C-alpha cells in the first residue's frame with residue numbers, strides 16, 4: 001500500500017553535502033575511490049571568502065564537500081553582504097559539527113517544486129527549522145529543516161548550474177573518471193529511538209512507510225509518493241550477545257547521524273572491480289567477504305536470475321544478493337569512510353520491477369542477516 005500522502009511535491013535526491021575539515025583532501029580521495037568527476041567549485045578563486053566547496057558527480061549522483069576558511073577572511077561581512085555561495089553555512093556550526101562527529105553528512109538534499117512552500121508546509125507540520133528559504137540570484141531557492149541529530153533535510157527548487165556562485169571546473173582539472181555509479185538510492189540515519197524519529201519525519205513530510213518482505217537493529221523506511229526518495233532509519237537493539245553496530249555508531253558519532261549512503265550502479269560488477277583495484281592506493285576498503293558457502297547457497301536462492309558465471313563473479317567481488325517477492329538486490333558495503341566507525345557506503349544494483357524501474361525493487365537486504373549467519377556454517381565444512 002502507498003497512500004501517496006506527500007505534503008509537497010518532491011522530485012528526486014539532489015545532492016549530499018559532507019562537512020569536512022579540509023574539503024580538498026576528502027574530495028580528491030572520494031573522486032579517485034568512487035570514480036566521480038570534479039564538476040563545480042565555490043572557493044577563494046570564485047570570490048567565496050567564507051567556505052571552500054567542491055562538487056563531485058557521477059551520473060546523477062552529486063557529492064558536495066565543504067570546509068570553512070578562517071573567519072578573519074570574512075569578518076567584515078554580514079549576511080546581506082556575504083560572499084558564501086551556500087547562505088545556510090556558518091563557521092561555528094561547521095566547526096562544531098566536525099569536532100563533534102568527525103567527517104560525515106551534514107545535508108541530505110532533495111529537489112522539490114518550490115523550496116519556500118516545502119519549508120513552510122514542513123514547519124507548519126512539526127519540522128524544526130534550520131535555515132529559512134533564501135533565493136539565490138533569482139534562480140534557485142534553498143531551505144533547511146532538521147532531519148535527525150545534526151543532519152538537515154535540504155530543499156532545493158529551480159525556476160528553470162549546480163548553484164549560483166559555483167563555477168564549472170576547468171576541463172584540465174576535471175578528469176572523466178567513471179566506475180558506473182549513477183544515483184543515490186537511499187540514505188540511512190541512526191537514532192537512539194526509532195518511533196519518535198519516524199513520527200517526526202513522516203509527520204512533516206507526509207512520507208509513508210515503505211513495506212519490507214540477532215540483527216542488532218530495528219528499522220523502517222520512509223518513502224516519497226513515487227518511492228524514489230527513500231529515507232530508512234535504524235535504532236539499536238540492546239542486550240544482545242554481539243553489540244549492536246547501531247549503538248557503536250551512536251557512541252563514536254556522539255549521537256544520531258547519517259549511517260550509510262547507498263549508491264546505485266548501472267554495472268555493479270564493473271564498479272566493484274574498479275573500486276577494489278584502488279582500495280590500497282587511496283580508495284575505499286570493503287567489508288570482509290562472506291564464506292564460499294554463501295555463494296554455493298546462491299544457486300537455490302537466485303539461480304533463476306543469475307547464471308553460474310554471474311554467481312561466480314559475485315563471489316570474486318564479495319557481492320551480497322537478496323530477494324523479495326518483487327525483485328532482486330545486489331549489494332556490498334565499504335569499511336567506514338573516515339577515522340571513526342560511523343558512516344560507510346553501500347553499492348547496489350536492482351533487478352526487476354520494470355514498469356523505468358520502481359523504487360526499492362528487491363528491498364534493502366535484510367534477508368542477508370539470516371543468509372550470512374546460516375552460511376557461516378562454513379565452520380562445519382572445515
Ligand SMILES: Cc1nn(C)c(O)c1C(=O)c1ccc2c(c1C)c(=O)n(-c1ccccc1Cl)c(=O)n2C
Nearest residue numbers: 188219221232245287333346364365366368369372
Ligand atoms: C539492514 C538495512 N536496512 N536498510 C533499510 C538498509 O538500507 C540496510 C543495509 O543496507 C544493510 C543490509 C544488510 C546488512 C547490513 C546493512 C547496513 C549490515 O551493515 N551488515 C553488517 C552489520 C554489522 C557489521 C557489518 C555488516 Cl556488513 C550486514 O551484515 N547486513 C546483512
Ligand SMILES: [Co+2]
Nearest residue numbers: 188262346364
Ligand atoms: Co542499505
